[PDB]
Amino acid sequence: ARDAYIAKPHNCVYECFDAFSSYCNGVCTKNGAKSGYCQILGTYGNGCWCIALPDNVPIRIPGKCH
């Protein structure tokens, strides 16, 4: 229902940093209301967090991006 480390469609964020530049929120901002923040990727790097309940089909991949 929500994204954990992904903020872009089928692509993931290389490394979300401080949201001071609203970089992570900026990606979630495109929705026009969706809200997201930058957390940790999990192992190494950073991950973007986005909250909302689109029509459906939130995450279709283990979170790994090309």
N, CA, C and O of each residue as an XYZ file, in Angstrom:
264
protein
N       0.861     -1.217      0.000
C       0.000      0.000      0.000
C       0.884      1.250      0.000
O       0.449      2.312     -0.445
N       2.090      1.135      0.483
C       2.999      2.316      0.513
C       4.399      1.892      0.061
O       4.713      0.702      0.068
N       5.221      2.831     -0.322
C       6.596      2.478     -0.768
C       7.557      2.619      0.412
O       7.398      3.525      1.230
N       8.530      1.754      0.507
C       9.485      1.836      1.645
C      10.780      2.523      1.206
O      11.099      3.607      1.695
N      11.511      1.917      0.312
C      12.798      2.523     -0.140
C      12.663      3.033     -1.576
O      13.627      3.554     -2.137
N      11.506      2.893     -2.162
C      11.321      3.348     -3.568
C      10.484      4.627     -3.610
O       9.539      4.777     -2.836
N      10.824      5.526     -4.492
C      10.059      6.798     -4.608
C       9.673      7.013     -6.071
O       8.718      7.735     -6.361
N      10.394      6.405     -6.971
C      10.081      6.565     -8.417
C       9.384      5.296     -8.920
O       9.536      4.229     -8.325
N       8.637      5.406     -9.990
C       7.891      4.264    -10.593
C       8.625      2.918    -10.459
O       8.744      2.396     -9.350
N       9.103      2.366    -11.541
C       9.810      1.058    -11.457
C      11.281      1.299    -11.115
O      12.040      0.345    -10.947
N      11.677      2.536    -11.014
C      13.096      2.843    -10.687
C      13.213      3.189     -9.201
O      12.258      3.689     -8.607
N      14.349      2.934     -8.612
C      14.531      3.239     -7.164
C      15.465      4.439     -7.009
O      16.131      4.830     -7.967
N      15.518      5.013     -5.839
C      16.412      6.186     -5.628
C      17.841      5.692     -5.391
O      18.052      4.774     -4.600
N      18.801      6.280     -6.054
C      20.212      5.839     -5.868
C      20.621      6.031     -4.408
O      21.289      5.170     -3.836
N      20.234      7.127     -3.813
C      20.593      7.370     -2.386
C      19.922      8.656     -1.909
O      20.482      9.739     -2.081
N      18.760      8.559     -1.327
C      18.084      9.791     -0.841
C      18.877     10.348      0.339
O      19.270      9.594      1.229
N      19.110     11.631      0.353
C      19.896     12.236      1.465
C      18.967     13.081      2.340
O      17.770     12.800      2.409
N      19.485     14.084      2.991
C      18.614     14.926      3.858
C      17.477     15.507      3.016
O      17.698     15.922      1.878
N      16.291     15.538      3.557
C      15.135     16.081      2.794
C      15.186     17.610      2.793
O      14.232     18.255      2.359
N      16.261     18.183      3.261
C      16.356     19.669      3.278
C      16.038     20.202      1.881
O      15.316     21.189      1.746
N      16.559     19.570      0.865
C      16.277     20.030     -0.522
C      14.957     19.416     -0.988
O      14.588     19.553     -2.154
N      14.259     18.756     -0.103
C      12.965     18.127     -0.488
C      13.183     17.212     -1.694
O      12.257     16.991     -2.474
N      14.369     16.690     -1.852
C      14.638     15.792     -3.011
C      13.710     14.577     -2.946
O      13.018     14.274     -3.918
N      13.692     13.898     -1.834
C      12.805     12.709     -1.705
C      11.352     13.172     -1.746
O      10.556     12.652     -2.527
N      11.012     14.125     -0.927
C       9.616     14.634     -0.918
C       9.278     15.155     -2.311
O       8.145     15.008     -2.770
N      10.233     15.750     -2.972
C       9.977     16.281     -4.337
C       9.481     15.150     -5.234
O       8.537     15.343     -6.000
N      10.091     13.999     -5.153
C       9.635     12.867     -6.007
C       8.200     12.500     -5.626
O       7.350     12.336     -6.501
N       7.933     12.374     -4.357
C       6.551     12.031     -3.912
C       5.621     13.229     -4.151
O       4.411     13.052     -4.295
N       6.167     14.416     -4.192
C       5.327     15.636     -4.404
C       4.640     15.602     -5.775
O       3.547     16.148     -5.923
N       5.246     14.988     -6.751
C       4.623     14.953     -8.109
C       3.181     14.453     -8.014
O       2.328     14.890     -8.787
N       2.904     13.566     -7.101
C       1.512     13.052     -6.966
C       0.557     14.227     -6.743
O      -0.587     14.190     -7.196
N       1.011     15.246     -6.062
C       0.130     16.417     -5.794
C      -0.398     16.330     -4.360
O      -1.188     17.176     -3.940
N       0.025     15.336     -3.627
C      -0.442     15.190     -2.218
C       0.315     14.044     -1.557
O       0.482     14.034     -0.337
N       0.765     13.099     -2.333
C       1.516     11.955     -1.754
C       2.653     12.505     -0.898
O       3.317     13.460     -1.301
N       2.882     11.930      0.255
C       3.972     12.449      1.130
C       5.033     11.371      1.345
O       4.697     10.216      1.605
N       6.285     11.731      1.241
C       7.366     10.729      1.450
C       8.567     11.381      2.138
O       8.690     12.606      2.140
N       9.433     10.586      2.706
C      10.640     11.143      3.378
C      11.839     10.238      3.084
O      11.663      9.143      2.549
N      13.027     10.668      3.418
C      14.230      9.837      3.116
C      14.679      9.056      4.350
O      14.931      9.643      5.402
N      14.776      7.759      4.220
C      15.225      6.913      5.363
C      16.501      6.172      4.952
O      17.362      6.751      4.290
N      16.628      4.926      5.327
C      17.848      4.156      4.953
C      17.483      3.075      3.937
O      16.412      2.475      4.030
N      18.346      2.826      2.990
C      18.055      1.784      1.967
C      17.837      0.441      2.665
O      16.986     -0.344      2.247
N      18.584      0.180      3.701
C      18.434     -1.106      4.435
C      19.825     -1.638      4.773
O      20.149     -1.831      5.945
N      20.628     -1.870      3.774
C      22.005     -2.372      4.019
C      22.989     -1.218      3.833
O      23.569     -0.732      4.805
N      23.173     -0.789      2.615
C      24.108      0.339      2.343
C      23.388      1.400      1.504
O      22.510      1.063      0.709
N      23.741      2.643      1.670
C      23.077      3.718      0.875
C      21.837      4.227      1.617
O      21.644      3.909      2.791
N      21.016      4.997      0.952
C      19.796      5.542      1.597
C      18.557      5.082      0.824
O      18.680      4.605     -0.305
N      17.392      5.215      1.404
C      16.153      4.780      0.691
C      15.067      5.848      0.837
O      15.049      6.578      1.827
N      14.182      5.942     -0.119
C      13.099      6.959     -0.034
C      11.811      6.302      0.458
O      11.499      5.178      0.066
N      11.080      6.982      1.297
C       9.812      6.414      1.822
C       8.637      7.239      1.294
O       8.637      8.463      1.426
N       7.658      6.600      0.712
C       6.482      7.350      0.182
C       5.201      6.753      0.772
O       5.059      5.532      0.827
N       4.287      7.588      1.206
C       3.030      7.073      1.822
C       1.805      7.483      0.998
O       1.701      8.625      0.551
N       0.898      6.555      0.805
C      -0.347      6.831      0.029
C      -0.963      5.499     -0.397
O      -0.320      4.457     -0.267
N      -2.172      5.515     -0.891
C      -2.817      4.244     -1.326
C      -3.366      4.404     -2.745
O      -4.577      4.514     -2.935
N      -2.496      4.416     -3.717
C      -2.891      4.551     -5.146
C      -4.000      3.562     -5.513
O      -4.517      2.871     -4.635
N      -4.364      3.484     -6.761
C      -5.438      2.530     -7.149
C      -5.084      1.144     -6.609
O      -5.963      0.416     -6.148
N      -3.828      0.784     -6.661
C      -3.392     -0.548     -6.144
C      -2.038     -0.908     -6.761
O      -1.449     -0.096     -7.474
N      -1.553     -2.091     -6.500
C      -0.242     -2.504     -7.079
C       0.845     -1.505     -6.666
O       1.360     -0.768     -7.507
N       1.186     -1.480     -5.406
C       2.230     -0.560     -4.873
C       3.646     -1.028     -5.230
O       4.352     -0.349     -5.976
N       4.054     -2.157     -4.713
C       5.415     -2.678     -5.024
C       5.284     -4.016     -5.756
O       4.624     -4.928     -5.259
N       5.893     -4.138     -6.905
C       5.809     -5.414     -7.668
C       7.195     -6.056     -7.726
O       7.362     -7.110     -8.339
N       8.166     -5.443     -7.107
C       9.545     -6.007     -7.129
C      10.114     -6.017     -5.706
O       9.689     -5.225     -4.865
N      11.052     -6.890     -5.440
C      11.698     -6.992     -4.100
C      12.336     -5.666     -3.676
O      12.907     -5.572     -2.590
N      12.243     -4.668     -4.511
C      12.845     -3.350     -4.170
C      14.159     -3.181     -4.931
O      14.812     -2.144     -4.814
N      14.544     -4.169     -5.693
C      15.811     -4.064     -6.464
C      15.544     -3.346     -7.789
O      14.613     -3.705     -8.509
N      16.336     -2.358     -8.107
C      16.138     -1.612     -9.384
C      17.344     -1.836    -10.299
O      18.420     -2.199     -9.823
N      17.178     -1.628    -11.575
C      18.314     -1.828    -12.519
C      19.392     -0.776    -12.251
O      20.422     -0.763    -12.924
